[PDB]
Amino acid sequence: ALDPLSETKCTLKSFTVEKGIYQTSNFRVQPTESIVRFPNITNLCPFGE
Amino acid sequence: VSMTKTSVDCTMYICGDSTECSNLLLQYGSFCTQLNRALTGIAVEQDKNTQEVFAQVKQIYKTPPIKDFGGFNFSQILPDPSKSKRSFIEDLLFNKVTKFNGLTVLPPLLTDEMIAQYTSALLAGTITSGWTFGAGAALQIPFAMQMAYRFNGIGVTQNVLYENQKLIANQFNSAIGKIQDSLSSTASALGKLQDVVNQNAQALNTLVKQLSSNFGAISSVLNDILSRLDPPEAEVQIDRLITGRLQSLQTYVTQQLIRAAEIRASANLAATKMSECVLGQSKRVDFCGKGYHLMSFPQSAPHGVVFLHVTY
Amino acid sequence: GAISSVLNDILSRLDPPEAEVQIDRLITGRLQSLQTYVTQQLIRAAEIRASANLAATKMSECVLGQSKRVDFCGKGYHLMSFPQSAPHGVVFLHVTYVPAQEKNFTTAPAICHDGKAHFPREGVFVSNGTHWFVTQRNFYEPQIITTDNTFVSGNCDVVIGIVNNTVYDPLQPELDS
Amino acid sequence: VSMTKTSVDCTMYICGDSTECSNLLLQYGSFCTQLNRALTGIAVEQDK
Amino acid sequence: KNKCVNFNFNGLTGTGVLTESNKKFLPFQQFGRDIADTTDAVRDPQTLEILDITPCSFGGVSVITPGTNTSNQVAVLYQDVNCTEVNVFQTRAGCLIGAEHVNNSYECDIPIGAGICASYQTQSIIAYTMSLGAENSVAYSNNSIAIPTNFTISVTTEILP
C-alpha cells in the first residue's frame, strides 16, 4: 500500500521483478453524497385530531 | 485467430458495492485468485496468436508504383492508403460482423489497422519477392518471372505462362468479383468467424443474466437481503449467492479456456498456412484447397484471417 | 464457509449433528479445488500433446529427410537438423541456408536463336551488359547457353519481352569450328 | 474421426417426472440450459 | 449529476451515477431495469425527467515496471477509463499516470494495449506507438533481379516441449 513499485512484488510473490506489465489490484469510486430529492409539500397532515 | 479479451473481476462481480459480501468471499481462500489469473492468462495468449500469424517478418514492405503485374489487377487485394488502410474486400468483412457490470473488455495489442499493415507487408513480399523475403533478404523479382518458378514446381512448362499472360489475367480478375458479390449479398460466408462471436457475445450476456438468480434465497440483490433481514438470516442468503455465482464464474472460465485451446490450434493452423502457402510454394496436396497451388493472398478479418488461395 | 480448516477441530468441538455440515462444506470446497486441478492440467496437457505432435514431426521429417515446407525447419532453405535431449522437452539444431550478399542485374525471360524460343530448365537469363547467360536463382553461377541447360519450347513471335542471342551448341566446336 | 453423439438432458437426469424439483432446478439460472447447449454443440461438431 | 452518489428515489436505494440519455419513460412506468434485472434507470418524482442509474467507475490497475537490475521507476496504469476523474497522459488503452507520451515510434518492449507499448530508454518510462518493422522498399521492375552471390550457413535454435 506504499507505492506501485512495491505493489508489484506482492502479486508476484518474488523479490526480483522482471520487465513487463503485471496486474496488482483494482480501483473503485467511493460514494460521497446522497440524493434525497422529493416533491414539495402543500399542507400539514391532521394527526393531532 | 484471436477471440474477445474479456477480463471479469472475481470480487466486484459477486460483491459489487457490498461490505458483508467481502467477509464471506475470502473464506474460500484462493478461489478468486485462480479465476482472475486464468482470465488474464487467456488474454495474453490472444495477442500472441496474432503475432505468430500476421507478424512473420521483421520488415514492413510497401507497394511498388508499377501496378502492371503482367495484366493482373491487384487493386482489390492491396489496401488503399488514402482512406483505415483497407481494401475493397476488407471493407465487406468488417461491415458484416456483430458497461460497468463487472465484465471488462480489454482491447487487443495488435489493432485492426496494424493487422492490415502486417497483411500489406506480406502482400508486397509474395508478389514482388516471392518466398525470398521470408527465407532471407528482400530479393526483387518481376511478377512475370515469379510465376515461372511456380508453374515449374508443379510440373507445368513455363512456355504456357508467357504466351497466355492476358488469358489467365481475365480469369483471375473475374474470380475476385465473385468473392465480393458473395460477401456483400449475405453474411453466410463468415460462418467460421460468426461461431467465435456467438460463443463470445452470448456467453458474455449469460453471465450478466446469471447474477439475477436467487440461488435458493429470497432475492439476488445484496442490499435487499442485508438491510431488510436479520444478520443471522442474511448470512445464509449471502453465502447462497456467493456459492451460486462462484460456480457460474468457474463455468465461464472453464468454457472459455477450451475455446481458447480450440482457437490456439486454429491459430497454429493459420500460422502454418501463412508460413507455407502464403510465404512460399507448397507441394502439399489440398493444403491451399483443391487444385495445384500457385500463390496465396491473405486478408484482414475481425478476430481472424481470410485466405484467398489461387489454384490451378 | 466453516469455522476452521482442520477436520479434527470441527468433530471434537461441535456436535456430531452440527459438525457434519461444516465437514461436507470442506469436502465440497476441496472437491472444487480438485475440479480446478484436473481441468487445468488436462487443457494444458492438450497443448503439450499438440506441441508433441509438432515435435515428433520435426524429428521424423526434418531430421530423417529434406523438407520442402517453407518456415518449417526454421528460416531459410533447410539442409539438415540435429535433435538433442532436454528435460521435459526437446531442443532443435536446424542447419539452414541463408544468403548473405546479392547484386542487381537485368533479366530476360527467353532468347531467340533461329525462330524458336529457348527457355532454361532451372533459372533465367541474366545479362551482364553484353550478352545473357544461364544461371540459377539460389546461387549466382554464370554458365554457357547450351541444349543441356535450356529447353526448346514455343516460338519467338508470341512471347512478350523476348530477346535475341546465340545458343552455343556442343556440336559447334566439333563440326562448325 | 468421430465418436458417439450422446446428448444427456439436464432436466430428465435430475428432475425427471417431478414438479417441485424444477423450482429448485430453474432457480440457478441458465446453468441447466448451458449443460444442454454444450452437449448439443458437441453433436454439431461430430457431424462436421 | 455525473457523480458516484447514494441515490434514493421513492425508496429505490442504491449506489449509482445519475447520467442522462435518450430514453423516454412511459407515463405509467416508474423505473427501468437492464438485462440483469437490476436498478438501471429511475424517474424524477417532481418533473418529467429520465435519470438513468449508471454504475460507478472501476477497472484493473496494472504497473509498468522494468527489470530489477535496470531501474526502479514505475508508472500507474488504468484500464478502459479516461483522465477525467481518475506527468499524466491519455493513451488508447486507458489513462496513464507516471509516464510521458512520445510521438516517435520504437520497438515494443513492455505492452500497454491498442498498439501502445512502453520501454525504459536513456532515463524514464515513455509511452509510444509500437513499430511493426523497419521500412524496406522492394525495387520492383520489369527486369531487375537480386541473385545471391554469397551465402552463410547459420544454425538456428528451436525449443519445443
UniProtKB/Swiss-Prot annotation, chain C:
Outcome (variant: H131Y): In strain: Theta/P.3
Cysteine-cysteine disulfides: C62-C73, C112-C156
Glycosylation sites recorded in the entry for this protein: N104, N128, N164
Phenotype when changing Q101H: In strain: Kappa/B.1.617.1
Record function comment: Subunit of the fusion protein that is processed upon entry into the host cell. Mediates fusion of the virion and cellular membranes by functioning as a class I viral fusion protein. Contains a viral fusion peptide that is unmasked after S2 cleavage. This cleavage can occur at the cell membrane by host TMPRSS2 or during endocytosis by host CSTL. In either case, this triggers an extensive and irreversible conformational change that leads to fusion of the viral envelope with the cellular cytoplasmic membrane, releasing viral genomic RNA into the host cell cytoplasm.
UniProt-recorded name of the protein: Spike protein S2'
Organism: Severe acute respiratory syndrome coronavirus 2 (2019-nCoV)
Organism ancestry: Viruses, Riboviria, Orthornavirae, Pisuviricota, Pisoniviricetes
Swiss-Prot record, chain E:
Subcellular location(s) of the protein: Virion membrane; Host endoplasmic reticulum-Golgi intermediate compartment membrane; Host cell membrane
UniProt-reported outcome of changing A99V: In strain: 19B/501Y
Disulfide-bond pairs as recorded: C4-C56, C83-C95, C108-C117
Effect of T122A: Partial loss of O-glycosylation by host GALNT1
Biotech use: Main component of the anti-COVID vaccine Chadox1/AZD1222/AstraZeneca; in which the human tPA leader sequence is added in N-terminus to enhance protein secretion.
Chain positions carrying an annotated carbohydrate: N69, N82, N103, T122, N142, N150
Top-level taxon of origin: Viruses
Effect after changing H101Y: In strain: Gamma/P.1, 19B/501T, 19B/501Y, Omicron/BA.1, Omicron/BA.2, Omicron/BA.2.12.1, Omicron/BA.2.75, Omicron/BA.4, Omicron/BA.5, Omicron/BQ.1.1, Omicron/XBB.1.5, Omicron/EG.5.1
Result for mutant: T13K: In strain: Omicron/BA.1
Post-translation changes: The cytoplasmic Cys-rich domain is palmitoylated. Palmitoylated spike proteins drive the formation of localized ordered cholesterol and sphingo-lipid-rich lipid nanodomains in the early Golgi, where viral budding occurs. Specific enzymatic cleavages in vivo yield mature proteins. The precursor is processed into S1 and S2 by host furin or unknown proteases to yield the mature S1 and S2 proteins. Processing between S2 and S2' occurs either by host CTSL in endosomes, or by host TMPRSS2 at the cell surface. Both cleavages are necessary for the protein to be fusion competent. Cell surface activation allows the virus to enter the cell despite inhibition of the endosomal pathway by hydroxychloroquine. The polybasic furin cleavage site is absent in SARS-CoV S.
UniProt note: domains: Contains sequence and structural motifs very similar to those of a bacterial superantigen and can directly bind and activate T-cell receptors. Activation of a broad T-cell repertoire may be involved in the hyperinflammatory syndrome in acute COVID disease. The KxHxx motif seems to function as an ER retrieval and binds COPI in vitro.
Family (UniProt): Belongs to the betacoronaviruses spike protein family.
Note: Variant D614G has become the most prevalent circulating sequence in the global pandemic since April 2020. The mutation is associated with higher viral loads produced in cell culture and animal models. It would not change pathogenicity nor neutralization properties vs vaccination. May be prevalent because the mutation increases virus transmission in human population.
Protein name: Spike glycoprotein
Gene of this entry: S
Full-protein residues shown: 535 to 728 of 1273
